[PDB]
Amino acid sequence: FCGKGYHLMSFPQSAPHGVVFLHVTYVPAQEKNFTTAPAICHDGKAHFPREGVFVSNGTHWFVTQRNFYEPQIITTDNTFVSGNCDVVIGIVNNTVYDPLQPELDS
């Protein structure tokens, strides 16, 4: 409706008997393949991304936002737990870091 791509903003310009809209949009570029999984199996629990997606570069698993590659460590703060690992089709095994663990470890 407001240009090709994800619409960011628009600017109006007057024209003879008309209007010209300059649509400023965000276009994704330089995409890269990654291996993806619906959920992460850890401690017999299924973890799902809170806002992002699980991606793998070949050896390590990360969670990133869907529209830009920004890999982050899969923690309990960006994932949520729902059920065990027996139900979700395609769940893979990976560790889930806990930020609170070094606090009581020290």
Ligand X SMILES: *[C@@H]1O[C@H](CO)[C@@H](O[C@@H]2O[C@H](CO)[C@@H](O)[C@H](O)[C@H]2NC(C)=O)[C@H](O)[C@H]1NC(C)=O
Contact 88, 94 (CB under 8 A): no
Nearer of residues 76 and 94 to ligand X, judged by Cβ = 94
> What whole-number distance in Å separates Cα of residue 95 and Cα of residue 6?
34
Q: Which of residues 41-100 bind ligand NAG (CB under 6 A)?
A: 89-90
Is residue 60 part of the contact set for ligand X (CB under 6 A)?
A: yes
- In angstroms, give the least distance from the CB of 33 to ligand X: 4
Asked if 85 touches other proteins (CB under 8 A), the answer is: no
Residues 40 to 69 in contact with other proteins, rule: CB under 8 A: 46, 48-49, 53, 55, 64, 66-69
| Residue among 76, 75, 72, 87 nearest 38 (CA) | 87
Residue 93 is encoded by which pair of tokens? Answer: 């095994």
**CA 43 to each of CA 1, 50, 83: distance values in angstroms, whole numbers, following the listed order:** 46, 19, 11
41 binds, among other proteins, ligand X, ligand NAG, none (CB under 5 to 8 A by kind): ligand X
